[PDB]
Design a protein around this ligand. Sequence first.
Ligand SMILES: Cc1cn(-c2cc3c(c(CC(C)C)c2)C(=O)NCC3)c2c1C(=O)CC(C)(C)C2
Length: 209
Amino acid sequence: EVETFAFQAEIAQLMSLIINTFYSNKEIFLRELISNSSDALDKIRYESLTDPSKLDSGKELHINLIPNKQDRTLTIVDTGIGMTKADLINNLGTIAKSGTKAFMEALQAGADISMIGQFGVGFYSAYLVAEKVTVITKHNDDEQYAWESSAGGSFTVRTDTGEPMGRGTKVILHLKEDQTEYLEERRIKEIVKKHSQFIGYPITLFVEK
Ligand SMILES: Cc1cn(-c2cc3c(c(CC(C)C)c2)C(=O)NCC3)c2c1C(=O)CC(C)(C)C2
């Protein structure tokens, strides 16, 4: 069963701005997604200090970058806290409402698209390079879910039928035809070195066979 939801008015407006604005510095999408993954990892690591059983679903705390030239997809895998059904539909969207409003007010006031992370809505920078984003997530307190959006004001949430994750999040970016440079080993290495060199978790770039 697939449930369809409309994005909050402010979010739909932000997504339209990210997709239609001419902005060449698209590489910032990777540091934003890596930062979300890093925050999820910080969360589970902190929680595990008072409750060690929170790591029964996996002890390894890492980030995996998986480019796929055949499928034209860039996958970001983390073994972070994951997201519940409530996080995907209500909680993160509620927090994102105030952040989006502030970011759009700042953009009008002279700020550029790269400052998106300061407003906590960095996830949506994925739409600078992706036509569709799929989020596979598993939190200790919930089942495995699949969130998906090609923008256009709506998103879908379904219980994931695929391979079990244990704990964490998989962000699958179905890249735009002209954004294939983000599938190149050399380009990903350069972006990670320039923007994510001090992330406190191992970042493993999966080389294509
Ligand atoms: C804000 C925001 C932030 N993120 C987001 C995106 C991600 C993660 C998190 C949680 C950590 C920051 C603790 C949040 C995460 O756990 N891993 C990478 C993807 C999303 C949003 C959304 O509005 C849509 C969403 C729920 C599909 C994803």
